[model samples]
Target: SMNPPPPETSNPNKPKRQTNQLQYLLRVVLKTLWKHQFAWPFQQPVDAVKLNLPDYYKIIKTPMDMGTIKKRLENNYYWNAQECIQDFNTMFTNCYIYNKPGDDIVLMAEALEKLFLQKINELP
Candidate 1:
């Protein structure tokens, strides 16, 4: 008797599952904007090196580490996560106001949240 043929393999050209392509596209756009708007101009004169997209993404997308915050606050004695985030917001706002530029906090925050989710999802 003849055996049945093996099952068909999946098409490699097709995506394994649906992805938020729009979100990914938005991330690329925002990252480009951030690099041009902040990273380039903020670099120190001595540190002015070519921006690496992967390195920039890694640096900015890393979660705000609480341990690092604790270490910094050890001398201050009163800093908390809430205060740290508020201070960061204030600094961004001041910079935008001084430069007469539109604040892109919402876009940045959404990009950050997407990065966080992608990182978490990649973990086994």
Candidate 2:
């Protein structure tokens, strides 16, 4: 009889939270935004790129080619596109963009935090 697959073993070396591409992207975007907004006390003022929040949602909702992302990450060996996309979508859908008016910024922040936390908890 074929042997059953070896019993699952938890590897301690593995990260408790796996950083996927989407999450990575989201974190980078947030970090980039933060850096653009505040970095130096005396530096000359710079105009930050105006991200069309709605356009971001539209772009991300489109079906992406994961293989392309994987190939790029393999070549770069420094980015996680899946987690990044997920994180960005979570942030955009939860906090930044809105389908209706009167969305409270504070509430959006809270919701984004919750969504991020939920994704963290789902780590393998």
Candidate 3:
């Protein structure tokens, strides 16, 4: 062959560098999301009993919220960005399912999802 593949010696720290970059990206995106106004409603799990929404748990089998996600990250629970993003998607999906389209909570969920997409677009 006219050309040969490069050797592994060229990039000794590649694996660690990739992991660090992804962690940094996740941290920054999460911080920004939490600071956004739309994120307020999603910061913690919905209080079904207090809200008089007994059907909430019955409808939402696997509930998620920003607080739990943050805690999971702090505990090194997620292996990659996709897993973390999946939880965000689930949280938004739960909101959409429980709230009407024109409702304020639904609107907040949409805004936060948009922001999440924008931030994660820069993922490596």
Candidate 4:
């Protein structure tokens, strides 16, 4: 944790650090997955209008699909990035801390995307 260059010196020109006001780890995590098209773990594009989501995704899964995914996340979608974040965090910790803020986010984004997709594909 002795890196990420101390959060880039707290930009004096930017909004006063809302670091504690809101925790962004999971948000960015979801943002990363959603951006990468992997947040909705189903295997294909359901109708965006039918589902009220993107033609390629869903925020709240079809309840029935929740059994397994929810079992792991205990029914919380916002906490969806836990597995990838935790495992990836441990996997990429230490010396890599030098580039911490940068790489961890990138790696978690990639790792979580693939991991979630894999889980989705596993579903029937």
Q: Cα lDDT of all candidates, in order?
A: 0.33, 0.36, 0.74, 0.33
What's the true lDDT of residue 4 in model 1?
A: 25
Residue-level lDDT for 29 in candidate 4: 31
List, residue by residue over 1-124, the lDDT tens digit for candidate 3.
1112211122333332325534764578788899998888788777776677888887887788887777666655655677678888899999999889989999888998898889888776
The TM-scores of all predictions, comma-separated, are 0.26, 0.25, 0.80, 0.21
Alpha carbon lDDT at 122, candidate 2: 49
Best by TM-score: 3
Residue-wise C-alpha lDDT for candidate 1, range 45-112, written one tens digit per residue = 11113433233322332222223222323333222333434433333343343333334644443344
Q: How far is 97's C-alpha from truth in model 3 (Å)?
A: 0.8
- As a whole number from 0 to 100, the lDDT of residue 103 in candidate 4 is 64
Model 1, residue 117: displacement in angstroms?
Answer: 13
The TM-score obtained by model 4 is 0.21
Clashing pairs in 4: none
lDDT of 2 at 77: 28
lDDT of 4 by residue, 1-124 (tens): 1111111222335433223112333344323444454334322222345544342222322222211222223223232344323433332232133234556444543555466445444332
- C-alpha root-mean-square deviation, candidate 2: 17.9
TM-score of structure candidate 3: 0.80
By summed lDDT, the worst window of 10 consecutive residues in model 2 runs over: 39-48
Over the full model, what C-alpha lDDT does candidate 2 score relative to the true structure? 0.36
Q: Could you tell me how far off, in angstroms, the CA of residue 44 lies in candidate 3 after the best superposition? A: 0.9
* TM-score winner, 1 or 4: 1
Clashes of each: 0, 17, 0, 0
lDDT of 4: 0.33
